[PDB]
Design a protein around this nucleic acid. Sequence first.
RNA 1: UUGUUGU
Length: 274
Amino acid sequence: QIKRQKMIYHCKFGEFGVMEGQFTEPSGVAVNAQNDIIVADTNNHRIQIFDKEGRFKFQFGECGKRDSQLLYPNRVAVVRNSGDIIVTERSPTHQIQIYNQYGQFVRKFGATILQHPRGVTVDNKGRIIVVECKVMRVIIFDQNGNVLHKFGCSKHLEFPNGVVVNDKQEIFISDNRAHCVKVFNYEGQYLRQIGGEGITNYPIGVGINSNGEILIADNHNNFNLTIFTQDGQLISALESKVKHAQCFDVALMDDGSVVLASKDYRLYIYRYVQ
RNA sequence: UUGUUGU
């Protein structure tokens, strides 16, 4: 058994509700280049943007099925070099909507292709990667909504709930029921495993930081954060002080921090390096 | 509209 440094959060915001700064269901969280916190407020049909200190900035998306209208947004990603926000809509829309940094509509696509989007992210070539649970599929789009890659992996995925990529076309997916992160390439080849049972049980998300370290997040008792090299060599392991409710999503921030979206309708900002 | 686990 491995020894974990203790970690605590230094910021916390949000509460149940329907007004600014309030959440019905904070299903997805993403961080942009100025470390704003973008939240998918699913049952409120809106995306909410805060600064790195939980301060509400603005919001966009009203109920509906046409342009400039979100129904059930569950996950978000950010195009870092543009500020654009990538939104995935749950059933019955099952599609992707792209908004700019100002919350204005750009385009939407993928409704005839997506079914169960459970994680989304963007690579350095601007390509959008989506992972789907229940059916176990990875689909990769360009910014214009053209499908570039599609592959199933029901043989290798039990419960995919998060995704990031590096600069080498490798895809890192957290598998909640495999208790690890599984690595694939864009062609669908199953490369390797990072983490495992006993060290990263029931992961709830995965991240990659500026050092190119793979962070696996779980909530199997405390809120645990296990940090690996891209090979799977263990670097660092941490556990929180508090115990949390169910957790939706995690997102990394510039200065060695993680945003943790909880069932208790509050986002918690942990720091994993002093 | 919604597959985490921690009875």
